[PDB]
């Protein structure tokens with residue numbers, strides 16, 4: 001396989017999501033959808049009266065539904081959050097300014113997202129492709145929480161005042177904005193709740209936001225496959241433009257990211273409406289891109305298999321990462337998965353490698369790691385594989401309590 005493309009769509013479910021899903025379905029391709037449930041409540045400032053229909057269609061035709069937070073952090077964009085906030089925030093266009101403030105509350109709007117989904121679609125948890133509890137992406141932020149050793153944050157993703165193009169904008173990578181620092185704590189809170197978060201390698205976006213109908217300038221299918229080619233094995237999350245889209249500290253050649261390209265785009269770019277002739281002009285771009293990427297040797301997959309799901313009969317090499325019932329695991333030795341050797345919290349074949357920082361069972365801890373346990377932070381003094389008898393509060397020799 002030339003490579004595996006993960007085509008992902010943010011900010012639905014809206015009416016245009018239906019057209020996008022139909023094109024994906026026609027071309028035999030599954031997408032990952034990072035949804036904001038406030039479109040179900042009718043307050044997202046889009047064409048969204050068919051949002052519930054769109055949510056159902058994504059579930060019924062096998063796409064992966066993931067968590068993009070209830071209201072896309074726009075409660076942080078305006079004074080008081082209400083039915084008109086999406087409209088108000090679209091009028092100033094200040095989505096990235098003070099986007100993250102109280103990280104505990106901001107992180108909890110990902111939990112609110114799931115409560116709303118389950119109120120509108122009570123059986124949503126009977127769908128195997130519903131990953132609202134396991135997969136998230138932060139609004140505006142090319143930040144990653146994949147494994148204990150695969151993480152990245154965009155340190156310029158949001159600002160305390162100026163936008164990246166406004167004169168006087170500065171991004172000090174080792175003194176980032178308060179909004180960025182808050183978004184980092186949000187990533188960490190979500191990982192401690194079991195989430196993986198995925199950023200993106202390339203953004204399928206209007207290449208001229210200036211003109212009256214910016215959607216029309218969405219990169220042509222052929223040119224965009226050129227960008228996907230360039231993103232392959234080139235650590236594109238750190239080289240992407242503009243500056244607020246970079247992921248900093250990305251572990252460039254890490255094996256879990258090899259031969260993979262995560263594409264970010266938005267259904268609202270494939271709609272005929274306020275942003276231009278998106279449907280009649282960009283929907284054909286999407287269909288053609290799907291066909292020519294397949295023709296070139298690419299394969300399309302969904303973010304739930306980005307970290308391959310463990311399966312009986314598969315072969316693993318020492319160091320391969322899998323995901324098993326939502327938990328990330330690293331292989332201790334080369335082997336062929338047999339049904340009794342599933343990863344677990346006491347398996348000697350697999351260790352837990354969740355990107356979480358709370359003390360966890362069966363983690364291969366290194367000296368210098370820091371874990372959180374019963375509200376306290378502990379430094380790991382001595383490398384060890386954690387186990388239930390070795391909790392930090394008692395193992396005064398393996399761990400040292402901090403602050």
Ligand SMILES: [Ca+2]
Nearest residue numbers: 133193194195
């Ligand atoms: Ca959870």
Ligand SMILES: [Mg+2]
Nearest residue numbers: 141157158183
């Ligand atoms: Mg941010």
Ligand SMILES: [Mg+2]
Nearest residue numbers: 194195326327
């Ligand atoms: Mg998980």
Ligand SMILES: [Zn+2]
Nearest residue numbers: 010011139140
């Ligand atoms: Zn978004």
